[PDB]
Amino acid sequence: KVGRLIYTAGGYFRQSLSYLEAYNPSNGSWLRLADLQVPRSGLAGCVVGGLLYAVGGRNNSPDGNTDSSALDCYNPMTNQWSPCASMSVPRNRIGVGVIDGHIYAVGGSHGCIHHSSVERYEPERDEWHLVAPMLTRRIGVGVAVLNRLLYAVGGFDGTNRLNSAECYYPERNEWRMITPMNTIRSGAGVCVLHNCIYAAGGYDGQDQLNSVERYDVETETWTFVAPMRHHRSALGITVHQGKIYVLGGYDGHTFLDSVECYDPDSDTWSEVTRMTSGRSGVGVAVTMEPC
Ligand SMILES: O=C(O)CNC(=O)c1cccc2c1-c1ccccc1C2=O
Numbered sequence: 001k002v003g004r005l006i007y008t009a010g011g012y013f014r015q016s017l018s019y020l021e022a023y024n025p026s027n028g029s030w031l032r033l034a035d036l037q038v039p040r041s042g043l044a045g046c047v048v049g050g051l052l053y054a055v056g057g058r059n060n061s062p063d064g065n066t067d068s069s070a071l072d073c074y075n076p077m078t079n080q081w082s083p084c085a086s087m088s089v090p091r092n093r094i095g096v097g098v099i100d101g102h103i104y105a106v107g108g109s110h111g112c113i114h115h116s117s118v119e120r121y122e123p124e125r126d127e128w129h130l131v132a133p134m135l136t137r138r139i140g141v142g143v144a145v146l147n148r149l150l151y152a153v154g155g156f157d158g159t160n161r162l163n164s165a166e167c168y169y170p171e172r173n174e175w176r177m178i179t180p181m182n183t184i185r186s187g188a189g190v191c192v193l194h195n196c197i198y199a200a201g202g203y204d205g206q207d208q209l210n211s212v213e214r215y216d217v218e219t220e221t222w223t224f225v226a227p228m229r230h231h232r233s234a235l236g237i238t239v240h241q242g243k244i245y246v247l248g249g250y251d252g253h254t255f256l257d258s259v260e261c262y263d264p265d266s267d268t269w270s271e272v273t274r275m276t277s278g279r280s281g282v283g284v285a286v287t288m289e290p291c
Contacts (some may be wrong), residue, residue, distance in 0.1 A: 001241070005289050008247055009054045010235055011279035012041035013255045016060040020074065023259070023273060024289065025240060030276055033290060034079050035099040036116045040068050042234075044096035044143070045283030046103055048123055051075055052287050055085065055105055056094035056240075066111045067092045071103075071121060071128075076290035088119055095143030097150045097189070099170060104131070106152050107138040110129075114139050116160040118168070130175045135166055140234075142190025144197050146217055151178070151197050153215075160195055161186045161205045165215070179220050182213055189237030189246050193264060198225075200262075203233040208252045212262070226267045228260050237285035250280045250290070 005022040010127055018035040031081030036054060043057030052074040057068045067090030074081050093107030098104070103121040105128075107114075114137040119130045138155030145151070150168040152175075154161070163180040188202030188209070196214040203209065208231040213222045235256075237244070244262040248255065257276035260269045 003289050004240065006240060006245055006247075007045065007052055007285055008239055008275065009045050009052070009283045009285065010036055010040045010041040010043050010057060011248065012060065012281040013277060013279045015039065015062065016041040016058065017279060021276060021278075022289070025272070028273060029291070030273070032276070034074070034081055034282045037072060037083070038068070039199060040069065040070075041281035043068065043281070043283040044094050045285035046096050046098050047285045047287045048098055048101055048103060052285055053084070053103060054283055055096050055103065056091035056108055057281075057283070058092035071132055072079075076288050079290050082089070085121070085128055087128050088130060089117065091113065091115060093139040093141070095138075095141040095152060097143045097145040099145055099148050099150060104143070104150055104168075105149075106143050106286060107134065107141040107155060109139040111163050112158075114156070132168070135175050135177060136162065136164060138162065141184040142185075142188045142191045142199055146192045146195070146197060147256055149217075150173060151190070151215075153197065153199050154181060154187040154188050161203065165273050178223060179215065181215075181222050182224065183209065183211060185209065187233040187235075189235045191237045191239050191244055193242070193244055198291070199243060200228060200244070201232040201235050202239060207231065208233040208250060214244070225264075226269055228269050229271060230256060230258060230260065232256055234280035236282040238284045238286055240286050245284075247284055248275055248279050248282055254276040255279055
């Protein structure tokens with residue numbers, strides 16, 4: 001369990017960013033690691049087999065906006081990125097979850113197209129294949145996995161921001177709606193902790209949110225927990241050692257550098273560190289420290 005860092009890849013501040021930086025909760029330090037090959041915001045991160053994957057996003061630059069179909073892999077042992085097979089379609093504002101060593105890429109946008117499509121990557125074969133699409137088109141969708149079921153939460157369908165959510169049952173290759181959230185949220189941070197799917201922050205169509213709610217997969221209810229100190233949309237999120245970490249985002253005024261940590265035992269958030277610069281739209285995951 002020792003030696004794991006919170007990695008943050010990419011993001012947005014004025015333009016899309018190539019940064020890869022890693023935070024060590026055990027000593028408060030940050031390390032700057034190898035830049036992404038292509039800057040990207042609105043991507044997702046995940047880890048399989050100790051390797052960090054950066055999935056989708058968009059490169060916003062002075063010279064254009066390019067939605068990404070890319071999958072790239074970072075090996076902490078070498079501090080190098082390597083390209084993997086690309087997805088079937090570009091997916092900005094994507095959601096990603098891992099089931100049994102396979103990466104699921106969910107939703108996202110390609111220009112004015114809002115995807116319902118979903119595809120699954122097999123690292124051993126370096127191949128993607130499409131699976132059943134969601135029941136709803138969703139960009140800015142939060143995704144998490146609990147008990148080998150994949151959840152897609154909230155987002156924006158091209159016309160409305162969503163409080164709806166749905167679950168994918170892999171053995172049936174089928175999606176079903178679950179109870180909707182109490183709050184409409186696009187660009188929330190979605191993760192799993194214990195028996196619940198958390199949705200933190202986001203944008204409800206009027207304001208960036210500090211509220212946080214959790215879906216108990218047994219009781220099928222959404223319950224609010226303590227709110228974050230800061231309102232934030234387009235935040236990064238992960239779980240490490242039984243606590244939720246939220247990173248950056250936009251509060252309606254500033255691109256935040258603050259990282260807050262949720263302790264479920266006390267139902268409290270605390271500010272634990274700051275990123276080296278404020279940014280939104282990062283991908284985040286946890287794996288072993290580099291070199
Ligand atoms: O739709 C979503 O999911 C979240 N949107 C927002 O919260 C949002 C709303 C109005 C203006 C802006 C943003 C925003 C979010 C992230 C980076 C920059 C901006 C930005 O200028």
